[PDB]
Write a protein that binds this ligand. Structure first.
Ligand SMILES: O=C1COc2c(CCNCCN(C(=O)CCNCCc3ccc(Cl)c(Cl)c3)C3CCCCC3)ccc(O)c2N1
Ligand SMILES: C[S@@+](CC[C@H](N)C(=O)[O-])C[C@H]1O[C@@H](n2cnc3c(N)ncnc32)[C@H](O)[C@@H]1O
Ligand SMILES: [Zn+2]
Ligand SMILES: [Zn+2]
Ligand SMILES: [Zn+2]
Length: 429
């Protein structure tokens, strides 16, 4: 197993991870090497396919020209996994489009063939033991899994010996239940991976640990003091949202309702859905209508980013914020969601001033809605610092970068390469 920790039966939460020794804020509980991992398509050329090192001058694979490495060693070591895609990418050309879930699942199947025995990534929980929620699958989810199975056969039949369709549905469901996104210091999506021992941890909206990445290695650090006998919890979702929103997401993606202190007390719900202090106060039904409108625009915008222009996307943000502002305060989470989306569009358009304008409005309400040590808060401070630095506002940039560092020292560790980069940004000016 893992020193100072153990697998146990968590009442009403299946299997979980329990502490056997105290952990202080910032302590590393454990590390978990990726069992299977894939670099996201849009990050190719920026990070090494094998070790995820972000570097300039990465060497391109000579055959496909769509895989980049540190050197010949990273190239060689990645070959058992890269071979699943190398020739297929050149053969299918423009038609090569398997989803990231399918890409990861192909790598799980390849790893099971090469290494059927328990790996150092499975000291407490094995990939084969993963919870699937197969019995809870509705028609919509089974149809999505069937599309994924067809893409798997379509793009990965060369090297893989497929189990029956029934075993594949269990696998795709286990991957959705237990799969991780690997994010960078700005929470930008890098890829997807399987960390079996990390997937043993249950969810809480007031977590006592944070998962970070050092290349393809997952690291688990305490963000609250943990005592012997206490269960180790991480957050599976974005904690900005009120209780109902959080539980709608947990029920849909993880088939459970959270009963943590935040979900039971609903303490932060009032400030999260802050209402304007108007002479004629807004009616209860007028609030409920705006909350319904707010959830609908969030989904409308989510769809729109796939086909609308940057100006159309900014229009949706501006127009929706205007309608919401008649009922909602600026610190309200639905206002903040649109502002964050608008900042993202500005960043893409390289409208640094516009991005800074939004980020400045988001930061204080983020600090109040998120937990004490939050990667969402650290990431926003970091973006702000980088925008300030890029726009020659060095004193403001240094202050924001140091706010990011203070959180990251706890979550990523004092010695994390990301902190060394940020300190170099402060020093280089
Ligand atoms: O064990 C875990 C896993 O989740 C955690 C997370 C969430 C990170 N993973 C997010 C990426 N991801 C998903 O969210 C999959 C959810 N699928 C959406 C709805 C759905 C659910 C079930 C099925 Cl059946 C299907 Cl059809 C569709 C997947 C996208 C595809 C690649 C794999 C990840 C954070 C901290 C954690 O500690 C955990 N712990
Ligand atoms: C990644 S697994 C965590 C390990 C899991 N308990 C097991 O036995 O394999 C995610 C699943 O654990 C359960 N789970 C996680 N957190 C929970 C919580 N706070 N309350 C109830 N169930 C939870 C749900 O069934 C969820 O889909
Ligand atoms: Zn490398
Ligand atoms: Zn190649
Ligand atoms: Zn909760």
């Amino acid at each position: 197993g893992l020193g100072g920790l153990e697998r146990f039966c968590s009442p009403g939460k299946g299997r979980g991870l329990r502490a056997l020794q105290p952990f202080q804020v910032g302590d590393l509980l454990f590390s978990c090497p990726a069992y299977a991992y894939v670099l996201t398509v849009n990050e190719r050329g920026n990070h090494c396919e094998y070790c995820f090192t972000r570097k300039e001058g990465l060497s391109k694979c000579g055959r496909c020209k769509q895989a980049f490495y540190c050197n010949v060693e990273c190239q060689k070591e990645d070959w058992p996994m890269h071979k699943l895609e190398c020739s297929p990418m050149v053969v299918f050309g423009e038609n090569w489009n398997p989803s990231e879930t399918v890409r990861l699942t192909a790598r799980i199947l390849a790893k099971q063939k090469i290494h059927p025995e328990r790996t150092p990534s499975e000291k407490l929980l094995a990939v084969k033991e993963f919870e699937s929620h197969l019995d809870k699958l509705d028609n919509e989810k089974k149809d999505l899994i069937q599309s994924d199975i067809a893409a798997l056969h379509h793009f990965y039949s060369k090297h893989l010996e497929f189990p029956d369709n029934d075993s594949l549905v269990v696998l795709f469901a286990q991957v959705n239940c237990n799969g991780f996104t690997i994010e960078d210091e700005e929470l930008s999506h890098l890829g997807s991976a399987i960390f079996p021992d990390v997937a043993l941890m249950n969810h809480s909206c007031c977590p006592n640990v944070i998962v970070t990445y050092k290349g393809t290695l997952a690291e688990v650090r305490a963000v609250q003091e943990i005592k012997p006998g206490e269960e180790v919890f991480t957050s599976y979702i974005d904690l900005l949202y009120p209780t109902e929103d959080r539980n709608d997401r947990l029920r849909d993606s993880y088939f459970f309702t959270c009963e943590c202190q935040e979900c039971t007390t609903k303490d932060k719900d009032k400030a999260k859905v802050e209402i304007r202090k108007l002479s004629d106060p807004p009616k209860a039904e007028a609030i409920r209508d705006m909350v319904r409108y707010a959830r609908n625009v969030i989904e409308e915008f989510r769809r729109a980013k796939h086909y609308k222009s940057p100006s159309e996307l900014l229009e949706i943000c501006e127009l929706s914020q205007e309608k919401m502002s008649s009922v909602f305060e600026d610190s309200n989470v639905y206002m903040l969601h649109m502002m964050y989306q608008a900042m993202g569009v500005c960043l893409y358009m390289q409208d640094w001033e516009g991005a800074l304008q939004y980020g400045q409005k988001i930061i204080k309400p983020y600090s109040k809605h998120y937990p004490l040590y939050s990667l969402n808060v650290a990431s926003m401070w970091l973006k702000l610092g980088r925008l300030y630095m890029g726009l020659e506002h060095k004193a403001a940039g240094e202050k924001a970068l140091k706010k990011a560092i203070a959180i990251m020292e706890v979550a990523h560790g004092k010695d994390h390469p990301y902190i060394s980069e940020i300190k170099q940004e402060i020093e280089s000016h």
